[PDB]
């Protein structure tokens, strides 16, 4: 995009404010590929943080209320039940109590999705380009059209085609709602985690978020026997 | 000096010469400066790589160093200075003498001399016996020469950090006090 279009989108997201860049991060040229590339990267970062944050907000609400799945997570005569992962503690403790294979495969599945989004050939095959090259800032390409060898049932966005045949006006309105909901949901999820780590940080939630001891920004806990994990966790931090 | 290579985005496209040593440098003096820089950079790259491999824990040379006199590659130890102290004086003299022969061949054999209008750092034998950097175009070759200069400048600072950690103990962080 350009700064003018970014200002217009800000006006459409909140006409009272309009553009709000106190740091002038849009003019901050990072990656040395022009203001258009920088604004594209920032827009994608906002959209992706928002998507992950709203998803994690719903996940935190669902997991913190004792709504584990009925089926099991590990397989064998001694397998970690999802109920055991629930009983591990609060949601962050559930993640830390996951098996190492579960953690690795979750994060690597997400990584596969991320590189799939970042590749320009698949984006061009699905239409549009990389978000730093004029494409739509936040747009996951089609795992079907990319040409993976086996035919996948569904794409990641809109698997059942419910937003299909949407009005273009509804599409723009939906993207505005996506950005704003993500903007608020980032604060929501970080407020949950901040209440978990520092009690009383978010005054409204008092006694309603379980405590947590380990670092939340540490995907692998002490149970994860992998290279350097224990040495990394040896020294803690606020 | 502005048209001598080695400048990059790290300086900002300009020459890094605050003390003004380039002002008092002629063409021959500038060629000498570049030749010394290239030699020191290459030596420091080799020295850092060797010291890091030896001290880090990499698989060092199998077998004996001296069958008679009973000195072994494993027995020499992983401290760099202690290893260079315990290696035989014959071996030290041999390394130094071969390096000296190569230095004198670099000085004399390359007849268009880097001081007398030649390319600094053009040691003819000791480069690319397998011909890897033979088909590279001038642009990528200049890029790689700048890479040589940058990497080796970093290597010089690295090896001086190593010897500072060995001499002035607890001097550099990320170097255990012994060495």
């Amino acid at each position: 995009e350009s700064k003018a279009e970014l200002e217009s989108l800000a006006g459409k997201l909140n006409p009272v404010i309009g553009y709000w860049d106190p740091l002038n991060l849009a003019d901050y040229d990072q990656w040395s590929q022009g203001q258009e590339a920088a604004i594209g990267f920032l827009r994608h970062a906002e959209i992706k943080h928002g998507r992950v944050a709203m998803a994690a907000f719903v996940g935190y609400i669902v997991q913190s209320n004792g709504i584990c799945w009925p089926w099991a997570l590990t397989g064998g005569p001694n397998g970690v039940m999802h109920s055991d992962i629930l009983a591990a503690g609060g949601p962050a403790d559930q993640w830390d109590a996951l098996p190492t294979a579960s953690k690795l495969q979750i994060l690597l599945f997400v990584g596969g999705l991320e590189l799939w989004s970042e590749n320009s050939y698949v984006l061009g095959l699905s239409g549009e380009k990389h978000y730093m090259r004029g494409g739509k800032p936040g747009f996951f390409p089609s795992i079907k059209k990319g040409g993976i060898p086996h035919p996948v049932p569904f794409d990641l966005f809109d698997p059942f085609g419910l937003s299909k045949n949407a009005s273009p006006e509804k599409k723009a309105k939906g993207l505005l709602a996506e950005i704003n909901n993500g903007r608020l949901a980032m604060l929501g999820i970080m407020a949950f985690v901040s209440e978990s780590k520092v009690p009383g940080s978010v005054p409204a939630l008092a006694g309603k978020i379980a405590p947590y001891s380990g670092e939340v920004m540490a995907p692998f806990a002490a149970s994860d026997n992998l290279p350097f994990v224990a040495d990394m966790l040896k020294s803690p931090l606020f | 000096v502005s048209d001598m290579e080695g400048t990059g985005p790290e300086t900002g496209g300009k020459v890094f010469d605050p003390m003004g040593l380039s002002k008092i440098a002629s063409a021959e003096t500038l060629a000498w400066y570049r030749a010394a820089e290239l030699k020191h950079s290459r030596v420091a790259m080799a020295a850092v790589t060797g010291w890091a491999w030896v001290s880090s824990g990499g698989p060092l040379f199998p077998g004996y160093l001296s069958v008679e006199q009973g000195v072994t590659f494993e027995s020499l130890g992983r401290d760099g200075y202690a290893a260079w102290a315990a290696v035989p004086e014959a071996g030290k003299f041999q390394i130094l003498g071969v390096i000296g022969i190569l230095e004198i061949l670099s000085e004399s054999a390359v007849k268009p001399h880097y001081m007398a209008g030649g390319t600094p750092g053009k040691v003819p034998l000791l480069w690319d016996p397998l011909g890897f950097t033979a088909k590279l175009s001038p642009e990528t070759l200049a890029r790689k020469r700048l890479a040589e200069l940058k990497n080796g400048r970093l290597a010089m600072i690295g090896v001086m950090s190593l010897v500072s950690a060995h001499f002035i103990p607890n001097s550099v962080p990320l170097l255990p006090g012994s060495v």
Binding site: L23, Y28, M232, P236, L237 | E10, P173, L174
Partner: protein, 228 residues
């Protein structure tokens, strides 16, 4: 003429006093450079001293009264209730070194030809604006915010208002200098600033020595403190 500009600036600073140079430093030939370059130097020095003295006064109120950031940092070795001369004395030696080094890097960027030329300016002794810190538009790694006006609150301000702001900068910097050394002087010659009698505690130790006492040699890094 640079002298004429300086006299007009003094009249703007205070028309009652006007140009007040009892020593003729504006006519001194510092380094043998001409009067324009010397006046550039003196104006830069005045503005720099005033700026740092204003920051020093605000930081004296911050440290002595008690105003600290939370978390792991240099703040956790300074004893509580320590006075403003003991805070700098009590921070780690690396903290003192890196503070002075960062200030040095900012000085270097302030006087570097690269940044001042990228901003379309010249050195303050070579026909430039005395007291101008350039944007970091020539630093190797693209830099988020500049030193002066980081949020660009003065992107659209009148040149007359900017001139009046510089007139304010000089005067307030002079007054801040006087106040800050009032604080320093009351601790090493008591009864010298009558108002501060009983407020500023005495301090036994050379102010002008930066690295004395050297302070603790603690290692405050936690995650990945391999250098310890």
């Amino acid at each position: 003429s640079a002298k004429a500009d300086l006299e007009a600036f003094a009249k703007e600073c205070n028309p009652v006093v006007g140009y007040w140079d009892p020593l003729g430093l504006a006519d001194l030939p510092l380094w043998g450079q001409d009067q324009d370059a010397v006046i550039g130097w003196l104006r830069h020095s005045e503005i720099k001293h005033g700026r740092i003295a204003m920051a020093g006064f605000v930081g004296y109120i911050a440290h002595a009264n008690g105003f600290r950031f939370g978390g792991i940092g240099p703040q956790n070795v300074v004893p509580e209730g320590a006075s403003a001369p003991e805070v700098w004395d009590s921070i780690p030696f690396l903290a003192k070194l890196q503070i002075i080094g960062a200030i040095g890097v900012l000085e270097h960027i302030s006087e570097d030809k690269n940044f001042l030329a990228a901003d379309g300016m010249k050195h303050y002794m070579r026909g430039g604006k005395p007291g101008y810190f350039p944007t970091f538009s020539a630093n190797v790694h693209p830099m988020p915010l500049n030193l002066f006006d980081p949020f660009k609150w003065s992107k659209n301000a009148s040149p007359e208002k900017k001139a009046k702001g510089l007139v304010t900068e000089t005067n307030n910097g002079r007054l801040a200098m006087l106040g800050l050394f009032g604080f320093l002087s009351e601790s090493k010659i008591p009864g010298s600033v009558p108002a501060l009698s009983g407020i500023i505690p005495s301090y036994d130790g050379d102010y002008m020595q930066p690295f004395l006492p050297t302070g603790p040699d603690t290692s405050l890094w936690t995650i990945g403190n391999l250098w310890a």
